[PDB]
Swiss-Prot record:
Belongs to the glycosyl hydrolase 46 family. It is an enzyme of class 3 (hydrolase). This is Chitosanase. The active site is at residues 18, 34. The lineage of its organism: Bacteria, Bacillati, Bacillota, Bacilli, Bacillales.
């Protein structure tokens, strides 16, 4: 996978793309009007897509009778229905934000992120034969935004479309740097015109993350060494140690 430094750098890139800061925002909650209800915390776990529910489940297992427990029935219905409704989540956004610095709530988010995003990104990276930290970091950021579902905008759909366009994966012998450049092209195209129309407007404004990641490749920093300087017209300027 990614070593301690590389993983932190990958996460700080993802944090810039999600929140305009290298400080991971565990307390973030916002309705984006992208069909996902509330988008929350370090991964942008959402109330429509099932993963905010998982965070609250994991937190409730560790800390019974916490301030978010009462939202479980509505969160469960929202996940079942893939619903954008936030009208029956009064107080949820403020309660989530109030736990931004809570050790157990942060740990619950880290656990769900590891299970849903980091481990699947590293597993699919292994399946594709990716050897570079930068490629693995791109996969990690990609699964966070796109999810690991079965739909045409999903992480694995992007991998398969890249493999087709590139003539194979790096495991098959395709040069990993060329493959990653094609992957970034495929991801850009998906963000500009996703199959999921609800997210088209939001995702079109996120394409700058592809250029930030490509700029690391163009510096030939495939080991994701630090410091990294992000120089983005969209997000601004950042340093990542
Ligand atoms: N102009 C910039 C702005 O862009 C910027 O604003 C930020 O912009 C971000 C990008 O738009 C935005 O991010 C959103 O939030 C998160 C990412 O942080 C995204 O949310 C994810 O969306 C996925 C796709 O819908 C969801 O997918 C689901 O994933 C799960 C888990 O993998 C799948 O479940 C699996 O299913 C399989 C098969 O059934 C099964 O085998 C597995 O076991 C299951 N685990 C689902 O199938 C899948 N649908 C995902 O759950 C969800 N978390 C969202 O897409 C992003 N748009 C930021 O929020 C926004 N603030 C600002 C920043 O300051 O700057 C401006 O300048």
């Amino acid at each position: 996978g990614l070593n301690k430094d590389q993983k932190r750098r990958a996460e700080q890139l993802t944090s810039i793309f999600a929140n305009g800061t290298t400080e991971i925002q565990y307390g973030y909650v916002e309705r984006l009007d992208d069909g996902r209800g509330y988008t929350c915390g370090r991964a942008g776990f959402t109330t429509a897509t099932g993963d905010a529910l998982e965070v609250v489940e994991v937190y409730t297992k560790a800390v019974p009778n916490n301030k978010l427990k009462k939202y479980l029935p509505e969160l469960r219905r929202l996940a079942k229905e893939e619903s954008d409704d936030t009208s029956n989540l009064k107080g949820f956004a403020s309660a989530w934000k109030s736990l931004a610095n809570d050790k157990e709530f942060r740990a619950a988010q880290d656990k769900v992120n590891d299970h849903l995003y980091y481990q699947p990104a590293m597993k699919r990276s292994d399946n594709a034969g990716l050897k570079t930290a930068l490629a693995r970091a791109v996969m990690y950021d990609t699964v966070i935004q796109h999810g690991d579902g079965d739909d045409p905008d999903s992480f694995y759909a992007l991998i398969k479309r890249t493999n087709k366009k590139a003539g194979g994966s790096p495991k098959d012998g395709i040069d990993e740097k060329k493959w990653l450049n094609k992957f970034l092209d495929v991801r850009y195209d998906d963000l500009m015109n996703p199959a999921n129309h609800d997210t088209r407007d939001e995702w079109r404004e996120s394409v700058a993350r592809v250029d930030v990641l490509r700029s690391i490749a163009k510096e030939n920093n495939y080991n994701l060494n630090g410091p990294i300087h992000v120089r983005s017209n969209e997000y601004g300027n950042f340093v990542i140690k």
